[PDB]
Design a protein around this nucleic acid. Sequence first.
DNA 1: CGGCACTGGAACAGGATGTATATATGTGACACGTGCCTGGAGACTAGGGAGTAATCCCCTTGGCGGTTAAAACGCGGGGGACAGCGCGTACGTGCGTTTAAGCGGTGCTAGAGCTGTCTACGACCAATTGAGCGGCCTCGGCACCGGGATTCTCCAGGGGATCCGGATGCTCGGGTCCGGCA
DNA 2: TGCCGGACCCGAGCATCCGGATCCCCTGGAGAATCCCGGTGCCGAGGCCGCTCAATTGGTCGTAGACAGCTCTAGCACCGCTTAAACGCACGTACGCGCTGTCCCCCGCGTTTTAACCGCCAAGGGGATTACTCCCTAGTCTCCAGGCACGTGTCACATATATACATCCTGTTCCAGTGCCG
Lengths: 97, 97, 75, 83, 83, 95, 95, 109, 109
Amino acid sequence: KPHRYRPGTVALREIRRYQKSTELLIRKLPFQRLVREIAQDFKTDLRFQSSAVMALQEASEAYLVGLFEDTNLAAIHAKRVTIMPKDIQLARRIRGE
Amino acid sequence: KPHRYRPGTVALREIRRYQKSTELLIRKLPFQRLVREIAQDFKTDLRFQSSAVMALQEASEAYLVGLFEDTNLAAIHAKRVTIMPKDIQLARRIRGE
Amino acid sequence: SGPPVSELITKAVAASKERSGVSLAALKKALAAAGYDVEKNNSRIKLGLKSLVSKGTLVQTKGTGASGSFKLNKK
Amino acid sequence: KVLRDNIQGITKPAIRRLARRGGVKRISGLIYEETRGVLKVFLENVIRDAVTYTEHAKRKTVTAMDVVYALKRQGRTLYGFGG
Amino acid sequence: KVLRDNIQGITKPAIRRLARRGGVKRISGLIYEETRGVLKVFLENVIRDAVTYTEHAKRKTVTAMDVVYALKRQGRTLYGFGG
Amino acid sequence: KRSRKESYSVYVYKVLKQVHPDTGISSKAMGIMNSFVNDIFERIAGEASRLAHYNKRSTITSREIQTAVRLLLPGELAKHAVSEGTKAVTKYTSA
Amino acid sequence: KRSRKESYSVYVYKVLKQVHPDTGISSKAMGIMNSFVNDIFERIAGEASRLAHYNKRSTITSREIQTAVRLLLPGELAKHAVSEGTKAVTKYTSA
Amino acid sequence: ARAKAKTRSSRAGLQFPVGRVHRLLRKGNYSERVGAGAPVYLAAVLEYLTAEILELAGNAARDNKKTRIIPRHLQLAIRNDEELNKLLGRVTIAQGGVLPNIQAVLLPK
Amino acid sequence: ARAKAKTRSSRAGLQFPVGRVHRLLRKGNYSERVGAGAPVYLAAVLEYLTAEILELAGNAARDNKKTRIIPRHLQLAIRNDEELNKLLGRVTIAQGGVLPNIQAVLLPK
DNA sequence: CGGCACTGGAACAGGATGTATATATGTGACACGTGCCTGGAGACTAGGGAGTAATCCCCTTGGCGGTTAAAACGCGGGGGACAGCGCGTACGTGCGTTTAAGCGGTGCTAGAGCTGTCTACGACCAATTGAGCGGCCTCGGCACCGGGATTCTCCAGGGGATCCGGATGCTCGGGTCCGGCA
DNA sequence: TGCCGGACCCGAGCATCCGGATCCCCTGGAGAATCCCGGTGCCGAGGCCGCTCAATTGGTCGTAGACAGCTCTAGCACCGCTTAAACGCACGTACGCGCTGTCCCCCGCGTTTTAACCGCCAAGGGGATTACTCCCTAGTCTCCAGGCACGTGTCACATATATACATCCTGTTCCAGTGCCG
């Protein structure tokens, strides 16, 4: 047969890979487009320093992966390996958001 | 047959009663005993405003109450009603503590 | 009217004859497909299957009590 | 002169009273001493800086205003004791 | 110029990459849209305040130092962007 | 006698009789209010201080304070506060 | 004509060569270090300003920073920083 | 020969002492110069928030038939108002208690 | 005529510019006067913390076998020091990444 | 009951693939030399913020008795936590496929950023006063107390329902009714 | 006028229908806890008065910042490629999910204890206050030297690519339990 790795092996390998790596994961251009879109909601005629945009990307990704680890340990407490957004809402509300 | 309530219902009435009431629930004299016990570990022969100790109390059981709603949310979210220390440990981690 | 629950559970267990015994969920689905008030007689059919286990007409395959699987007797 | 055990003066009826005010219904038996230790940790966290306050304020009496500072640098802002 | 649907500018496999970096093993399909809403709330907050900065700075270009202000006023402090 | 201790209890009690002519106050609630107003005063003045740092400006204007109001206040609180302070600034300008 | 901007990256580099002469550094890492310096500076400065404001103090001495750091620093770091700053201020005082 | 001294609070027609708060700003080690209208504006918005919180607290006290405000109704006002609660999430109240919050999953059959 | 210009950092044996520190204090408006030993003590404890964190960064970099330290070395240095994690828990780091941390429940068997 | 065929169940070999390494090659951003100047530093003066002496009083801590409601232990039992079984779906993984971000180049400009001006507005000081603060008083709302109204909550028990077993009666076959037959 | 077989009416079989045993279900009995209504006595809150000290007016004056103008820079916009990832779907499986069996732990109700609280009282420890006087540091003058800008070059490091091992999963062999016959 052609080989197929059993589920979880590949996922844990990418966990090791991206805990090893440091770089941004979302493509920068659609994120930038989203930044422009959100800033347009407040005021038109706005330009953007790129350093601001990468700062937003890094801060947002760090915020997300932090709450990912939080919901991860929450689902570990909840005896599951599959995350559901009820865990996310609980983490936000207990965290205070 | 003597009167006896089923379990939890009196606890529910206690929950309601205590959620209306605002008073301190610990006997305060052991609380100053603890305050002076811990205080002499940093510097001995410190005197205390009673109002200082009351502020310490209000902050203390306020933090404990908020921790307790978080603990209850943890106990429910793992499909239960009874608290265990793993709720407390998870709450301490997700609170950044 | 219909027969007592022993009749229904006996055809529930004898409908398929899987290699392992019929599970409680599968026999519940079989009685639902054939047509019976599983909603209200659930305690009734649980005590009935407990009775047929105690009579030795039916033998529990894997679990104990209502859990596990159930199959017909040896002969 | 010294103090040795007042943490067991934290009565488990008081703990369960806070649990009911905290909304906890059913409580394990092992909860009490661990919450005692946790709140005790919180107590040293406050009173260490409170001791530092009274030392820098050059006093031997602890006042509620230093308590206000000690709660507030962790952002536990309590009203009615400042003044 | 005019942009409409950058809600899906975050792709699902990007979220899966973040979740593997976030240590998540099994991901529901319901996760991505809820996380999209959460990140929208967070960016609306910080970018609204960044706009407040830049209009207070009377500029038509934002700076990353405004972003430094936007991260610091809840203590999400980031280093290396002109700070 | 003792030294004078300044309080907002007179001013807040005036505001109280403006909005609720009927009700009384407790001293504990008033200490809560004073701790409140001093806290939020040093809050808003602190962010104004950082704005003075970031703008490299020696003199504090109302403009910086309205900006700091959009920093602190949640939403319609901020817009209404901006409106009320705007009218108060106008009639103060006309004395 | 460019406006000279003050940064501590040369001081960070010399500190690094003090602790590790063999070790280099990236420019963004030096930006992180300067951000750290400014961050701890503003923390300790605001805290010292508040402690001056509490005890009606208008002159800041190293005693107040020693108090404020032993507040902000837990564990052995506070004791060691107090000791090292004590030697530095002491032999400065002799100087 | 000096004219009659009005107060800056009277010039704004307001309750809070402009001179007191402006003095607080000047001796707060915040700036050497402070514009004239900024303490007036700050007193105005402090008046706004004070009247808002006091009005809601008085309404809450009227709900429980007491004409003297207590910290319990202060807690009820601050926590039932999401802008006020979000504004003061990190804020502790003495003898205010908590909002009565019962989980429906805790309720019996 | 006049004495040799001699730096206060050298007098305190230090590296960080104590004159710049004291000037930024004066422009920081923290007090209307500042004692002489205060910016010295500030500078000194800053080299103390800087030496500690750069020691940790050097440990990480020699563990990561790279000569020039990078923000990943900074992250790996700081986040295994839990004492700094009480000190700097609310701090995010550009391109630092995260600690590799896989739980045993994720591990099979 | 035993014994062997049948079946499950564990250990191991082995391959494929990612994981980790060794070295060859630009590389550009680290890294380090210099021009200058403007902030750092040396000295003088002011003059005052602050360190300490004295006080006193007052607020903090301890002690004594009593009491009582809180607290602590026994029982105990049921209900929730956990164990276990079984299943069905929803990603995991593993291919093809579309696109789209990205990189690199070009051309533009708004607008940030630096500098002269001036000018108006805030800081600082003499006069002063009136509003704000401290103490007291009086009171009226409010907390504790007492009694009944009310409403929830838990079990007792009769009714619905159902099922194994006797009753029963109609059905299913044989001594007695019934008529031809000797 | 008795005799013998045919048919039927009487006994048997067995199904069948409830008789009573038993399990669940809905509503009332009971109990009690809790809200609502005054009564009482009380104690802090609001009002007032007297007294102070800082807001205020008035003036000056200097400098902070707003504007005018010039410059020049990264952002912005377009575009041409251009592979990395996005998408998408399809089988597969394993993990949530949900039901149930069991068990003992902790809510509830009691008895027993006990120390918290009141409250009453003294002692005295130190905080808080005014004042005095001076050490030091802000402000000013004049002068200099390392930091920033900038230039310049060059090795730590990514990438590439070819080897070498780890490991993950899965087929395969040895071996014990069960099932059905000897």
